[PDB]
Symmetry: C3
Subunit: 266 residues, 3 copies
């Protein structure tokens, strides 16, 4: 109803025993630096992936809301963004399998959607689920990207800066709560991206999320291109900041906040 | 569209005759937060039992609403269920009435208003009252007015509802009103008028007004006293602010004049 | 299928001309500069005999809190609620030649189902060509002729058009999904986009409506009554000519656009 199983079904074959981890990367909720969507597209570009299930966008999408992009060329509609919301099996650089659910966060039917996904985690013997978030924070581009973690399998992440807070709901948050309630392992990882940079792609944040997954799911992920991309935008941001004194004042101010907060947390 | 609660609550009734239904849907006319405050006040203050729960998967655009989630101790501890439910509520004398409250549906207004009419039949409801709070050009320094529309408006004694022809944006409750009418049923909509410049923050005098209009026309005994305290406290914050400013004092006095003038026209036309 | 209900009894669709009807698609909510899409359907509906063939189910298609269809309260009663009908009609021109029109709200929901349903109706009624209508805010002055561009595969039916053209990315619409589906099924389909002065776009611009309906009249070979739009265009133009001499900043903005236009009118042709 929510989704359709691919035929024939791809095999999730671990030469490694123990269930795969599931990575949830839904675009439309917390997309600072485009880090969440950049995470899934990067893995898809660099690794062998196979489609397991496609969700039905007619059950799930408010299209006047999303207006999937159309290409007109040679005077005809040549292309419309399909906005695939799909479950994949992806092989890391050792061919170790993991699962990815990526695409648009649904507009609709969050209850049925999260039940569908929980059914899928049971069907594929998933042992951990990690959801990805990218949040704009009062931080400078001159300090390391911080990740915070919530959930019951947070222990698996070695680089982590983790009080009571109230946030707008998201499909992935409903999903986490449902997994928790069912006694399954589940975390959400949120990368903190400088607010003055959140509207644009910010590769350091994508890198940080992917490093967090590589570490806690024990995956061998190819991340060197994103390191170079991060180098580039950083060199770029440094000109923009050195060619102006008022920006140069905010960054020092934010660095001080960060370094002072760093001691406090340590 | 909904699920009936099991085991069902026995909504009688001795107290002969059918209950009235109160419709308090958040998302349409929420000036001073007065619709949601009315229902949540009754819920906190009176005994209530759940009768039916609507299915949010049929009814809600969750990316528009984003029901709030709490994270504490590195754990997702709660998520607002956004329950749109029908309740049996009992006043201070244990007299039953019905309340439909929760979010105005984003979707399926046709199936929704039809499901609601099957429920009013199911429960032998005899009158339906929908609540609205509108921002108006009225001052905080004058009593809160409620206007009425429908076919059972007669049951509301105090209502400065000198009306003409107007076109408003549609709502799920207005659709439901039109369907109850067309089906031959008793239905009214009460709008409380809230100073426009205070409409974004809680304005308890309006909640109070909506509730006493309901107590009046449905013959209910409601505990209202915490809302009186609240109203006096917001009034004082408002006095203090208008006090600081001659520009604001000028704006309030002009609304006061407008208000008094229309009140004259109203009593002249309503001996 | 669940998207719509066929009217019963079924209206008369046949004409005296061989080959099937042209279908005009006019969905409000996507490209509405000058209100020219919605004025296209309602101008024709007011002028011509029309008959309902099918209504789409708004509960399947509509986010009502985003549309909030207008309610009339008078004599302290709810008298009226806009039904926001999305309907397929058979319309007759002034020679009584039939054509088809799908008009009303662009759906919020179920674009895949919606466009499959429309293709079904296209086949059921032997539609030979489908034209979708768009009105876009553009950097053109109100002092120069309104232009239409066309994209699709039946584009040549339209004599007077500044298309063709080349590569662009636009937000998607229900009519764009449908165009693509009709293209992928080997059918005839075009989209006509009227260019409306950006500074005038939030208000009615009848000249845009007129250009749209003339484009249809020429390319579907329909005898459409359009004179009332010429008179509406005159009224709105005068009102704009007045507004242009009361304000001197407005005159520079218009004067700049005028040359941008007239240049590229010659420069690139």
């Amino acid at each position: 109803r929510m989704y359709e199983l691919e035929y024939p079904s791809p095999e999730v074959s671990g030469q490694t025993a123990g269930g795969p981890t599931l990575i949830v990367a839904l675009q439309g909720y917390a997309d600072a630096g485009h880090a969440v969507e950049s995470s899934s597209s990067h893995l898809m570009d660099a690794l062998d992936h196979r489609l397991i299930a496609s969700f039905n966008n007619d059950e799930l999408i408010d299209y006047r809301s999303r207006r999937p992009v159309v290409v007109i060329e040679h005077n005809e509609v040549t292309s419309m963004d399909e906005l695939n919301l799909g479950l994949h099996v992806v092989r890391d650089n050792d061919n170790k399998p993991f699962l990815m659910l990526s695409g648009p966060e649904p507009d609709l039917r969050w209850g049925d959607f999260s039940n569908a996904v929980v059914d899928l985690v049971e069907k594929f013997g998933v042992e951990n689920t990690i959801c990805l978030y990218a949040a704009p924070m009062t931080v400078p581009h001159t300090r390391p990207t911080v990740v915070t973690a919530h959930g019951n399998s947070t222990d698996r992440l070695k680089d982590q800066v983790s009080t009571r807070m109230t946030v707008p709901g998201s499909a992935s948050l409903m999903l986490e709560k449902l997994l928790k309630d069912k006694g399954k392992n589940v975390s959400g990882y949120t990368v903190h991206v400088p607010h003055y940079v959140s509207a644009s792609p910010y590769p350091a944040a994508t890198l940080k999320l992917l490093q967090s997954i590589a570490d806690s799911a024990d995956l061998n992920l190819p991340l060197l291109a994103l390191e170079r991309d991060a180098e580039k935008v950083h060199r770029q941001l440094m000109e923009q900041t050195e060619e102006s004194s008022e920006i140069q004042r905010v960054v020092g101010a934010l660095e001080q906040q960060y370094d002072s907060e760093l001691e406090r947390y340590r």
